[PDB]
Amino acid sequence: TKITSSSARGEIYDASGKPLVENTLKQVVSFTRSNKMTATDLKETAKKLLTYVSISSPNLTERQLADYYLADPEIYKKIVEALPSESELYNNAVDSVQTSQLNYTEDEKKEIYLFSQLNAVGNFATGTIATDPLNDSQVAVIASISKEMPGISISTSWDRKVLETSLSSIVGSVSSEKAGLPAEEAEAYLKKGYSLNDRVGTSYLEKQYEETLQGKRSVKEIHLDKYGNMESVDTIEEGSKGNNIKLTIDLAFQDSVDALLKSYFNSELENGGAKYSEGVYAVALNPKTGAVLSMSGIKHDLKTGELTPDSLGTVTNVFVPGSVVKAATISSGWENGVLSGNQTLTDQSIVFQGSAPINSWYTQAYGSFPITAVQALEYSSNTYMVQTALGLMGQTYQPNMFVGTSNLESAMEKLRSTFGEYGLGTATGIDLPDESTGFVPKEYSFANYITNAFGQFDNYTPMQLAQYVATIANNGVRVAPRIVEGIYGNNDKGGLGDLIQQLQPTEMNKVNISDSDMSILHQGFYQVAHGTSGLTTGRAFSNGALVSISGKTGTAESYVADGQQATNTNAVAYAPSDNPQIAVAVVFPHNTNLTNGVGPSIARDIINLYQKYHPMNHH
Ligand SMILES: [Cl-]
Ligand SMILES: [Cl-]
């Protein structure tokens, strides 16, 4: 019969090898029990044990001492013998019966302590021992003569803490050792084979890579007679440490992305754009490899005005995305064959039976006129995006048309299905216990369909967004975003050793459209930044850029507390346009300023930050 004990937990390192968490080892004495060993039996061990170990402060309470004087049964007998007019109840009386003001040798007072500690253990439990820190002889003497203090043994326990660093948030947490195994999912684990008292990640990374992090568990079994009385504890095998884990993210860069966010947010908080803003989020990738460069964010409490840092924000919160999604939609055009190559449509106000016109930002000043898909992205035409929704539904626009909704349920799914190919509304496959997968309602109206066609309906996570543009920058091959780069062993000191196995990127699916369609998409994103039209939306991308950037900017509007029309200024982009090495999305919700969206501008400076970090040009 053997007892298990979690082993040194593995550690976590940023891209650079800077460490993120703390193991603090400390060898100590565990004491088992036994419905058998007994007051007397425990005293015997107490003294034997004090021959080894150090203890100055014995701030014993009286209630304790009482219990120790009563330890001799005779004693207890004789004590009760004296009380006048239920076991523990009558213990309760007898306990308080003896006036306790009575002497004990000062070294006395010390194994009375232990005894308290020893007694404190539940039957069959294995407890520890409020002691006085231990050297190496003191310790390894015990290593040898447990079997001479039937029960006792010394264990290596550990504290695990998280360092203050931008990534702290992501790391997650592990169960304390006083905690054990959190019932909730608790059972599922015993089935996977864990000792009950183990310590496991409760969330995020600590949980995600549990397999590999968990250090092989330490071991001891116990012997005893046909009568159950303890005979001695024993070590079959002491535990080792875990494997380690190196991240795709480099601190300094994540760090500097973050002030960039602060800088920009303060700007908007200053000039008042941000009064109603919940915050701002930004995520960066390698589009080809799916590695994460940084996930940054800033929560802003509207009540106290205070600003709190938030990185999980990327994977946990959802926003209406706005114009940043039109590609998805055009791409549903092509798959379902409503658009042919670079399709020409006519930009005109969209009006349905007895209801508000539906328009693009330019639409009413420019009257109606024709326009290519490439152009449609350039000027961010909703009409085109809505004429295309219509297409899927199988109808073609006439002014004032009644719409038969028979093809609706079918239509919304077709579109939605494409969005999901890009990562929008579908799981990313990120390496974490739980990404929220958007706000895609199944109960939806017709208005809902058409507004979904320009990203004013379904709600998306910032992490989803990055993936969607990353996919475009990859040529329609969606790669699962991962935060871990490689698993690494240990070195002689116990720090970052070296390569166990490098994690390779995993392809989620290819977006089925032609290359020539994909290139037609690429051209648009290119002209959203470099275009020379009075209508071009994102020349902001190109202002002061260190490399050629292609992106797509976004606004969606609305409601905003006791308000007030206001909008989101998200923006997705990648680069270099020629040979895309970084993909980014920035979401900046309920913005007040509505005039010049700082979403693109932010993403530019992110990219700029990165290339100033890791030059990407260099044919
Ligand atoms: Cl304004
Ligand atoms: Cl600017």
XYZ file of C-alpha atoms and ligand atoms in Angstrom:
621
model
C 0.000 0.000 0.000
C 1.408 3.322 -1.280
C 0.787 7.102 -1.032
C 1.112 9.576 -3.887
C 2.395 13.186 -3.800
C 2.492 15.658 -6.693
C 6.023 16.382 -7.875
C 7.935 19.576 -8.709
C 5.796 21.384 -11.247
C 7.249 22.317 -14.629
C 7.910 25.956 -15.529
C 7.034 28.453 -18.247
C 9.295 30.667 -20.304
C 8.618 33.582 -22.603
C 10.028 33.610 -26.118
C 13.367 34.916 -24.834
C 13.817 32.469 -21.967
C 12.715 34.946 -19.335
C 10.764 32.900 -16.784
C 7.136 33.566 -15.800
C 6.623 31.620 -12.551
C 8.243 30.513 -9.320
C 8.974 27.208 -7.673
C 10.076 27.489 -4.038
C 11.180 24.094 -2.693
C 11.376 23.236 0.998
C 11.907 19.774 2.444
C 9.716 18.860 5.378
C 8.264 16.056 7.605
C 4.976 14.284 6.767
C 3.188 12.307 9.455
C 0.768 9.523 8.675
C -1.837 8.132 11.029
C -3.669 4.980 12.024
C -6.752 4.221 14.035
C -4.036 2.422 15.985
C -1.243 4.699 17.200
C -2.566 6.462 20.178
C -1.910 9.175 22.743
C 0.856 7.192 24.422
C 2.019 5.943 21.038
C 2.155 9.543 19.882
C 4.016 10.956 22.851
C 6.703 8.292 22.258
C 7.212 9.561 18.728
C 7.085 13.217 19.833
C 10.157 13.055 22.045
C 11.999 10.759 19.637
C 11.331 13.384 16.987
C 12.540 16.402 18.985
C 15.969 14.750 19.146
C 16.306 15.918 15.517
C 14.405 19.108 15.001
C 14.363 22.765 16.127
C 11.581 24.768 17.805
C 11.857 27.979 19.775
C 8.353 29.511 19.836
C 5.858 27.358 21.623
C 2.869 29.690 21.844
C 0.591 26.790 22.913
C -3.021 27.491 23.855
C -4.321 25.874 27.061
C -7.081 23.895 25.364
C -4.123 22.074 23.779
C -2.144 21.330 26.930
C -5.267 19.979 28.561
C -5.581 17.455 25.778
C -1.998 16.373 26.389
C -2.314 15.865 30.110
C -5.403 13.762 29.439
C -3.399 11.643 26.956
C -2.525 9.124 29.666
C -5.797 7.159 29.935
C -5.426 6.453 33.606
C -5.123 10.252 33.961
C -8.412 10.777 32.045
C -10.011 8.094 34.226
C -8.843 9.765 37.410
C -9.828 13.211 36.095
C -13.385 12.225 35.233
C -13.455 10.296 38.533
C -13.652 13.713 40.133
C -16.304 15.402 38.000
C -19.898 15.250 39.335
C -23.228 15.247 37.447
C -21.899 12.036 25.155
C -18.305 10.843 24.851
C -17.041 14.052 23.247
C -19.628 16.040 25.185
C -18.266 14.566 28.418
C -14.795 15.069 27.083
C -15.847 18.720 26.574
C -16.623 18.997 30.285
C -13.613 17.039 31.563
C -11.392 19.059 29.226
C -12.327 22.350 30.841
C -12.423 20.668 34.259
C -8.715 20.725 35.095
C -7.328 24.157 35.973
C -4.428 24.115 33.543
C -1.961 26.410 35.228
C 0.658 23.756 35.704
C 4.284 23.462 34.792
C 6.175 21.875 31.958
C 9.921 21.942 31.335
C 10.643 24.602 28.738
C 11.871 21.897 26.344
C 8.825 20.058 27.480
C 6.576 22.752 25.945
C 8.160 21.721 22.657
C 7.166 18.113 22.166
C 3.834 19.087 23.570
C 3.767 21.234 20.485
C 4.630 18.434 18.049
C 2.178 16.229 19.863
C -0.437 18.874 18.997
C 0.789 18.805 15.387
C 0.878 15.023 15.330
C -2.577 14.681 16.813
C -3.850 17.232 14.345
C -3.718 14.563 11.656
C -6.873 12.747 10.574
C -6.881 8.963 10.557
C -5.277 7.601 7.439
C -4.338 11.104 6.396
C -0.769 12.166 5.918
C 0.015 15.570 7.415
C 2.970 17.864 7.937
C 4.780 19.453 10.800
C 5.081 23.088 11.832
C 8.782 22.859 12.470
C 11.932 24.908 12.021
C 13.536 24.955 8.533
C 15.863 22.069 7.765
C 19.485 21.577 6.708
C 20.874 18.471 5.001
C 22.070 16.112 7.745
C 19.167 16.864 10.053
C 17.033 15.928 7.058
C 18.814 12.929 5.630
C 19.121 11.327 9.055
C 15.344 11.128 8.993
C 15.702 9.823 5.456
C 17.176 6.723 7.080
C 15.359 6.021 10.341
C 11.669 6.603 9.573
C 11.375 2.907 10.246
C 12.563 3.790 13.766
C 9.868 6.372 14.359
C 7.129 4.222 12.831
C 5.257 6.737 10.741
C 7.289 9.866 10.222
C 8.923 10.899 7.015
C 10.241 14.037 5.368
C 8.793 15.378 2.126
C 9.700 18.067 -0.349
C 6.780 20.447 -0.491
C 6.591 23.529 -2.724
C 5.183 27.019 -3.184
C 4.243 28.128 -6.702
C 3.778 31.813 -7.498
C 3.268 33.906 -10.634
C 5.642 36.738 -11.442
C 4.356 40.185 -12.325
C 4.658 40.435 -16.092
C 2.220 41.270 -18.861
C 1.790 37.554 -19.503
C 0.899 36.783 -15.901
C -2.760 36.869 -16.947
C -2.353 33.988 -19.420
C -0.332 31.668 -17.241
C -3.395 30.659 -15.209
C -3.243 28.973 -11.803
C -2.762 25.590 -10.178
C -4.564 23.951 -7.302
C -2.885 24.526 -3.961
C -1.720 21.395 -2.242
C -3.975 22.163 0.651
C -6.598 22.225 -2.113
C -6.032 18.866 -3.792
C -8.364 18.218 -6.672
C -11.331 20.417 -7.478
C -14.447 18.220 -7.288
C -16.205 19.978 -10.133
C -14.088 18.229 -12.780
C -12.460 16.387 -9.926
C -13.802 12.913 -10.715
C -13.021 12.886 -14.444
C -9.376 12.947 -13.249
C -9.239 9.919 -10.939
C -10.393 8.136 -14.088
C -7.388 9.540 -15.956
C -5.339 8.175 -13.080
C -4.502 10.948 -10.613
C -3.859 10.581 -6.935
C -6.659 12.425 -5.112
C -4.380 14.854 -3.345
C -2.630 15.995 -6.536
C -2.208 19.578 -7.759
C -3.394 20.531 -11.192
C -3.880 23.621 -13.306
C -7.329 25.063 -12.761
C -7.253 27.309 -15.789
C -5.472 28.639 -18.839
C -2.020 27.483 -19.661
C -1.403 25.781 -16.303
C -4.377 23.643 -17.188
C -3.866 23.475 -20.936
C -0.508 21.731 -20.993
C -1.152 19.691 -17.890
C 0.016 16.416 -19.379
C 3.525 17.750 -20.084
C 3.955 20.089 -17.104
C 3.011 17.700 -14.317
C 6.190 16.349 -12.707
C 6.195 12.611 -12.177
C 4.638 12.011 -8.821
C 6.465 11.052 -5.671
C 5.847 7.751 -3.944
C 5.705 5.950 -0.635
C 3.955 2.882 0.733
C 3.552 1.639 4.230
C 3.780 -1.741 5.966
C 1.997 -3.094 9.083
C 0.919 -6.196 10.995
C -2.161 -8.378 10.759
C -3.377 -5.893 13.372
C -3.044 -2.655 11.430
C -0.693 -0.781 13.812
C 1.804 1.322 11.869
C 5.197 -0.274 11.132
C 6.878 2.487 9.145
C 6.680 4.733 6.077
C 8.932 4.435 3.049
C 10.060 5.949 -0.265
C 9.735 3.811 -3.416
C 10.682 6.732 -5.644
C 11.079 10.454 -4.949
C 9.475 12.736 -7.491
C 11.255 14.581 -10.273
C 10.291 17.846 -11.918
C 8.122 18.596 -14.899
C 8.949 19.376 -18.480
C 9.108 23.031 -19.390
C 7.381 25.166 -21.921
C 8.535 28.029 -24.097
C 6.106 30.598 -25.489
C 5.729 32.128 -28.904
C 5.456 35.560 -27.262
C 8.385 37.826 -26.383
C 7.901 39.936 -23.279
C 9.553 43.244 -24.299
C 7.452 43.337 -27.452
C 4.189 42.429 -25.776
C 5.213 45.017 -23.212
C 5.773 47.766 -25.733
C 2.598 46.908 -27.646
C 0.918 47.636 -24.383
C 1.985 51.186 -23.726
C 1.189 51.801 -27.396
C -2.289 50.813 -26.342
C -2.099 53.009 -23.232
C -0.789 55.941 -25.248
C -3.621 55.677 -27.744
C -6.272 55.053 -25.161
C -5.242 57.982 -23.010
C -5.435 60.075 -26.179
C -9.059 59.113 -26.607
C -9.800 59.385 -22.908
C -8.238 62.779 -23.013
C -10.049 64.282 -25.975
C -13.168 62.515 -24.773
C -13.710 59.873 -27.447
C -13.449 57.096 -24.872
C -16.041 58.138 -22.299
C -18.260 55.204 -23.341
C -15.542 52.831 -24.409
C -15.174 49.551 -22.583
C -11.620 49.424 -23.819
C -9.320 48.427 -26.577
C -7.940 45.089 -27.732
C -5.194 44.107 -30.114
C -3.863 40.770 -31.229
C -0.852 39.889 -33.410
C 0.157 36.731 -35.265
C 2.397 34.992 -37.597
C -0.078 34.324 -40.436
C 1.994 31.564 -42.046
C 2.864 29.743 -38.834
C 0.014 30.672 -36.508
C 2.403 31.689 -33.781
C 1.173 34.434 -31.477
C 3.217 37.559 -31.325
C 1.144 39.335 -28.663
C -2.367 39.514 -27.215
C -2.899 42.845 -25.524
C -5.919 44.669 -24.113
C -7.262 47.321 -21.845
C -10.402 47.069 -19.823
C -11.915 50.360 -18.759
C -14.460 50.499 -15.964
C -17.064 53.088 -16.915
C -18.106 53.632 -13.299
C -14.888 54.657 -11.547
C -13.247 55.543 -14.851
C -10.258 53.429 -13.893
C -8.146 51.523 -16.360
C -7.253 47.883 -15.725
C -5.019 45.691 -17.939
C -6.670 42.822 -19.829
C -5.214 40.261 -22.196
C -7.749 37.432 -21.974
C -10.065 40.079 -23.378
C -8.994 38.823 -26.781
C -10.490 35.395 -26.316
C -13.318 36.087 -23.977
C -15.221 39.111 -25.199
C -17.155 39.661 -28.359
C -17.919 42.767 -30.354
C -19.796 43.715 -33.473
C -17.064 43.780 -36.105
C -18.354 46.136 -38.806
C -16.810 46.633 -42.246
C -13.743 44.556 -41.438
C -15.506 41.458 -42.591
C -16.650 42.245 -46.129
C -14.085 39.807 -47.608
C -15.717 36.845 -45.903
C -18.969 37.944 -47.535
C -17.657 38.437 -51.050
C -16.021 35.095 -50.595
C -19.369 33.596 -49.882
C -20.343 35.282 -53.129
C -17.784 33.304 -55.079
C -18.257 29.905 -53.433
C -22.002 30.006 -53.961
C -21.393 31.417 -57.451
C -23.273 34.728 -57.228
C -20.165 36.699 -58.137
C -17.936 35.832 -61.110
C -14.276 36.843 -60.808
C -14.047 40.556 -60.082
C -17.757 41.282 -60.299
C -19.186 44.634 -61.288
C -22.278 45.763 -59.510
C -23.942 49.168 -59.243
C -23.738 51.175 -56.034
C -27.191 52.559 -55.152
C -29.364 53.098 -52.087
C -31.045 49.910 -50.966
C -34.711 50.305 -50.077
C -37.125 47.579 -49.042
C -40.925 47.614 -48.774
C -41.915 50.507 -46.448
C -38.585 50.783 -44.625
C -35.494 52.985 -44.141
C -33.121 53.342 -47.072
C -29.978 51.237 -46.786
C -26.842 53.113 -47.716
C -23.072 53.350 -47.839
C -21.162 56.251 -46.411
C -20.684 57.748 -49.923
C -23.885 56.345 -51.330
C -26.172 59.315 -51.205
C -23.784 61.978 -52.484
C -22.461 59.833 -55.314
C -25.856 58.767 -56.669
C -25.731 55.245 -58.189
C -22.849 53.803 -60.224
C -20.926 50.642 -61.019
C -18.129 49.193 -58.987
C -15.860 46.112 -58.873
C -15.352 43.801 -55.914
C -11.818 45.152 -55.614
C -13.291 48.632 -55.545
C -16.058 47.449 -53.230
C -13.515 46.663 -50.603
C -11.622 49.861 -51.344
C -14.569 52.183 -50.730
C -16.205 49.833 -48.238
C -19.528 49.558 -50.118
C -22.298 48.012 -48.034
C -24.660 48.084 -50.944
C -22.455 45.660 -52.856
C -22.221 43.509 -49.698
C -26.035 43.549 -49.394
C -26.729 43.058 -53.063
C -24.554 40.035 -52.598
C -26.535 38.826 -49.599
C -29.623 39.049 -51.782
C -27.824 36.926 -54.351
C -27.364 34.014 -51.987
C -31.022 34.247 -51.159
C -31.572 33.753 -54.892
C -33.239 37.050 -55.735
C -32.025 40.237 -57.501
C -32.683 43.795 -56.324
C -35.486 45.926 -57.621
C -36.445 49.146 -55.879
C -39.035 48.625 -53.143
C -39.072 44.837 -53.306
C -41.070 42.553 -50.942
C -38.870 39.572 -49.974
C -40.175 36.003 -49.779
C -38.276 34.503 -46.869
C -38.515 30.867 -47.975
C -34.813 30.835 -48.884
C -33.797 32.621 -45.688
C -32.946 29.841 -43.267
C -30.919 28.385 -46.121
C -29.322 31.719 -47.011
C -28.112 32.701 -43.562
C -26.504 29.329 -43.070
C -24.661 29.523 -46.410
C -23.118 32.833 -45.598
C -22.527 31.847 -41.985
C -20.821 28.759 -43.248
C -18.229 30.778 -45.120
C -17.571 33.114 -42.181
C -16.815 29.981 -40.183
C -14.210 28.930 -42.740
C -12.283 32.108 -41.904
C -12.549 31.561 -38.152
C -15.394 33.959 -37.692
C -17.883 32.333 -35.361
C -16.066 29.054 -35.413
C -13.514 27.806 -32.926
C -9.974 29.097 -33.568
C -8.311 25.954 -32.254
C -6.235 28.103 -29.982
C -4.218 26.211 -27.400
C -6.351 27.169 -24.393
C -9.017 25.491 -22.331
C -11.719 27.886 -23.557
C -12.223 30.443 -26.298
C -15.724 31.896 -26.541
C -16.925 31.156 -30.100
C -18.816 34.376 -30.838
C -22.437 35.436 -30.503
C -24.150 33.581 -33.307
C -27.876 33.488 -32.425
C -30.004 30.791 -34.055
C -33.113 32.904 -33.527
C -32.673 35.597 -36.186
C -34.754 37.880 -38.412
C -34.391 39.051 -41.988
C -33.041 42.446 -41.051
C -30.586 40.338 -39.105
C -29.502 38.450 -42.222
C -28.723 41.545 -44.227
C -26.958 43.415 -41.453
C -24.867 40.303 -40.829
C -23.662 40.771 -44.387
C -21.667 43.785 -43.285
C -20.785 42.730 -39.744
C -23.376 44.543 -37.704
C -24.925 41.425 -36.269
C -22.949 38.334 -35.260
C -20.484 38.977 -32.483
C -16.842 38.018 -32.653
C -13.793 37.680 -30.478
C -10.716 39.719 -31.270
C -8.820 36.441 -31.469
C -11.250 35.205 -34.141
C -10.741 38.387 -36.166
C -6.901 38.033 -36.290
C -7.383 34.511 -37.606
C -9.746 35.731 -40.303
C -7.238 38.228 -41.727
C -4.360 35.860 -41.053
C -6.122 33.413 -43.270
C -6.335 35.957 -46.061
C -2.658 36.694 -45.586
C -2.072 32.974 -45.891
C -3.940 32.471 -49.123
C -7.003 30.902 -47.658
C -5.263 28.400 -45.392
C -6.432 28.806 -41.828
C -3.790 28.045 -39.202
C -4.617 27.343 -35.575
C -3.141 30.073 -33.366
C -0.851 28.733 -30.662
C 0.907 30.304 -27.760
C 3.435 27.568 -27.048
C 6.517 27.208 -29.210
C 8.301 24.147 -27.852
C 8.645 21.839 -24.865
C 12.036 21.895 -23.174
C 13.690 19.659 -20.581
C 15.717 20.674 -17.531
C 19.337 21.618 -16.794
C 21.514 20.695 -13.857
C 20.271 23.642 -11.793
C 16.659 22.901 -12.701
C 16.053 25.740 -15.144
C 15.205 25.817 -18.833
C 17.018 22.756 -20.221
C 16.503 22.081 -23.931
C 14.307 20.835 -26.729
C 11.923 17.967 -26.055
C 9.794 18.635 -29.146
C 8.908 21.703 -31.216
C 5.193 22.352 -31.775
C 4.445 22.626 -35.516
C 1.549 24.693 -36.932
C -1.690 22.891 -37.813
C -3.856 23.673 -40.790
C -7.532 24.081 -39.891
C -8.885 24.049 -43.409
C -8.410 25.809 -46.686
C -10.943 28.421 -47.715
C -12.194 26.997 -50.978
C -11.973 29.751 -53.578
C -9.782 30.222 -56.608
C -6.309 31.675 -56.177
C -7.344 34.348 -58.644
C -10.258 35.136 -56.429
C -7.890 35.089 -53.451
C -5.611 37.473 -55.348
C -8.573 39.680 -56.187
C -9.080 39.831 -52.443
C -5.404 40.629 -51.997
C -5.583 43.489 -54.447
C -8.441 45.047 -52.544
C -6.633 44.933 -49.253
C -3.703 46.433 -51.043
C -5.703 49.336 -52.359
C -7.465 49.976 -49.100
C -4.099 51.347 -48.095
C -2.412 52.558 -51.213
C -5.387 53.789 -53.205
C -5.770 57.221 -54.737
C -9.547 57.448 -54.896
C -11.556 60.118 -53.159
C -13.343 57.138 -51.673
C -10.378 55.066 -50.429
C -10.939 54.229 -46.739
C -7.531 53.378 -45.280
C -4.737 55.582 -46.476
C -4.154 55.824 -42.737
C -2.468 52.418 -42.924
C 0.187 53.812 -45.222
C 1.062 56.984 -43.351
C 4.540 56.541 -41.833
C 4.658 52.794 -42.374
C 8.001 50.981 -42.447
C 6.732 48.361 -44.815
C 3.927 47.890 -47.316
C 0.680 47.185 -45.410
C -2.654 45.863 -46.636
C -5.747 45.966 -44.451
C -9.429 46.690 -44.150
C -10.973 49.167 -41.756
C -14.254 48.895 -39.978
C -17.055 50.798 -38.435
C -20.294 49.715 -36.882
C -22.471 52.098 -34.953
C -25.422 52.492 -32.630
C -26.798 52.721 -29.231
C -24.401 53.783 -26.487
C -25.834 54.170 -22.961
C -27.775 57.386 -22.402
C -26.726 58.361 -25.880
C -26.179 59.077 -28.567
C -24.916 57.605 -31.823
C -21.306 56.323 -31.737
C -19.218 53.622 -33.363
C -16.497 50.987 -33.344
C -13.222 51.540 -35.154
C -11.794 48.082 -35.525
C -9.185 47.293 -38.157
C -7.485 44.198 -39.564
C -4.310 44.199 -41.610
C -1.157 42.254 -42.463
C 2.331 42.754 -43.872
C 4.482 43.038 -45.733
C 1.891 42.983 -48.512
C 4.405 41.282 -50.761
C 5.380 38.536 -48.276
C 3.146 38.610 -45.163
C 5.026 37.967 -41.950
C 2.580 39.529 -39.472
C -1.196 39.655 -39.124
C -3.022 41.981 -36.769
C -6.494 43.069 -35.700
C -7.453 45.947 -33.466
C -10.831 46.366 -31.861
C -11.782 49.705 -30.326
C -15.487 49.608 -29.333
C -18.126 52.197 -28.490
C -15.794 54.916 -29.690
C -17.156 58.332 -29.303
C -15.124 60.302 -31.794
C -16.672 58.789 -34.870
C -14.712 61.201 -37.077
C -11.240 59.711 -37.736
C -11.124 56.108 -36.518
C -7.929 55.370 -34.681
C -8.271 51.634 -35.326
C -6.144 51.429 -38.485
C -3.642 53.897 -37.127
C -3.183 51.751 -34.060
C -2.690 48.560 -36.071
C -0.171 50.298 -38.275
C 1.889 51.251 -35.269
C 1.668 47.703 -33.997
C 3.034 46.364 -37.237
C 5.591 49.176 -37.173
C 6.528 48.182 -33.617
C 7.060 44.603 -34.783
C 9.176 45.281 -37.824
C 11.257 47.674 -35.757
C 11.686 44.612 -33.544
C 12.268 41.966 -36.173
C 12.816 43.477 -39.649
C 10.661 41.636 -42.138
C 11.868 43.237 -45.380
C 14.958 41.504 -46.925
C 13.957 39.663 -50.117
Cl -16.913 63.845 -35.172
Cl -1.988 59.086 -37.664
